[PDB]
Structure 1
Amino acid sequence: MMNERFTLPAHSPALAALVPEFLDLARAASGDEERDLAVWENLTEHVSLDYRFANPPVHGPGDWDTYDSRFVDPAGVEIGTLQGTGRILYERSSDAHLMMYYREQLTFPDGTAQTAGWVDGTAILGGAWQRFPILGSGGRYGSMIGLRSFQPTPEAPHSLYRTHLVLREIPGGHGLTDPEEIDAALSLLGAFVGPSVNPATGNGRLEPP
């Protein structure tokens, strides 16, 4: 008797199950429920960033970048690396902030994890902390979700970031393999940490700036 158009996709329960675990990460990271946990705090992210302008003089839609990162802990030990890609897709109606979609692959000696989501490009210039959700994708991290928080250092905003990473096992894993559903989970969790995609304006319209 259920209306098809009110029923949600098959993966929705698995998605929903990520939500409480995500809210729990901070507490689990603070020393503590015992599952496998990986916490790296006060990392130095050595970023080598190839930033391309589409209309060279100033940032705008169409711009893109790639970057490679090295995660080095306070003692100088490299704990993992990262490949990232980003594209500027549009300007918000309300304030013309530069909206960018990013995807990243984190590679640790014992496994891999991935990231995707929205970044306010205007805010990164201003020096804001950014946060991406993580889904584990292989090895030790395959059963894990987490959070990546990074801030571009004032001295070298394009080469050194300060970064914290937390990944935590979910019992029996998050259960997502399809890229479609992985992207949906990353959108769901990003809702808590990511910028607003297009805030309501004054004039009741979403016209372009």
Structure 2
Amino acid sequence: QALLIKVPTEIVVKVVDDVDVAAPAVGQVGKFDDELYDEAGAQIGTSSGNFRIEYVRPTDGGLMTYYQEDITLSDGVIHAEGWADFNDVRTSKWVFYPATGVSGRYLGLTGFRQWRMTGVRKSAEARILMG
């Protein structure tokens, strides 16, 4: 059993944050609510989550940020949390972290939440891959 959910458009509907996107810093935080859409423009879910920039990776200056969210799809909830490099976030590169099925279709499944910013504080593309 493997499943893939493609999310060609994910909209940031509300975000409260103190990130400076041009010069982000350790200790900056954000809280967000998104809406997830399929290839036809139908809404397939929402997400509500938060993040904190925690440390700078010493090898390359990556801005290591801990994300936590609950993704509510029409057929169940998936919790996702883990690490991303905020330099990848702000440069429209893919980021990822583990996801754990909480309810519905996803109970007992585990996998990965992936996304890439396409518009600052407004839009992304995403994939959820579970097994």
After TM superposition, the score normalised by the length of structure 2 is 0.86
Partner in structure 1 of residue 103 of structure 2 = 138
Distance in 2 (CA, whole Å) between partners of 1:42 and 1:107 is: 13
* CA distance in 1: counterparts of 2:67 and 2:36, whole angstroms: 18
Please identify the structure whose Cα radius of gyration is greater. 1
What is the 5 A alignment of 1:158-197?
158-168=121-131
Task: Please report the RMSD computed on the Cα atoms of aligned residues, expressed in angstroms.
Answer: 2.1
What is the distance in 1 between the residues matched to 2:58 and 2:83? 16
8 Å Cα contact 2:83/2:96 also seen in 1: no
Q: Which amino acid in 1 is paired with 2:16?
A: D
- Per the alignment, residue 84 of structure 1 pairs with 49
Tell me the distance in 2 between the aligned counterparts of 1:78 and 1:67.
17
Aligned to 1:72: 37
1:42 offset after TM fit, Å?
4.4
Give, in whole Å, the separation in 1 of the partners of 2:88 and 2:3. Answer: 29
Q: Kindly state the Cα deviation for residue 63 of structure 1 after the two structures are TM-superposed.
A: 0.3
2:12 & 2:38 partners in 1: Cα distance? 14
Letter in 1 for 2:104: G
Deviation at 1:110, TM superposition (A): 2.4
SS at 1:140 equivalent: helix
Shift of the alpha carbon at 1:38?
A: 4.1
**Cα deviation digits, residues 100-128 of structure 1 (max 9, x gap):** 11111111222211111111112222221
Task: Give yes or no for the alignment of 1:119 onto 2:84.
Answer: yes
* Partner in structure 2 of residue 149 of structure 1: 114
User: Who is 2:63 aligned against?
Assistant: 98
Deviation at 1:39, TM superposition (A): 2.7
CA distance in 2, matches of 1:165, 1:93: 30
Structure 1, residues 39-73: CA drift from partner, whole Å, max 9, x if none? 322421011332214x8x84211100011111110
Deviations 1:5-54 (A, max 9, x none): xxxxxxxxxxxxxxxxxxxxxxxxxxxxxx4x54322421011332214x
Equivalent position SS for 2:97? strand
User: So what's the TM-score if we normalise by structure 1?
Assistant: 0.56
* Structure 2 segments unaligned to the other structure (5+ residues): none
User: 1:83 & 1:139 partners in 2: Cα distance?
Assistant: 18
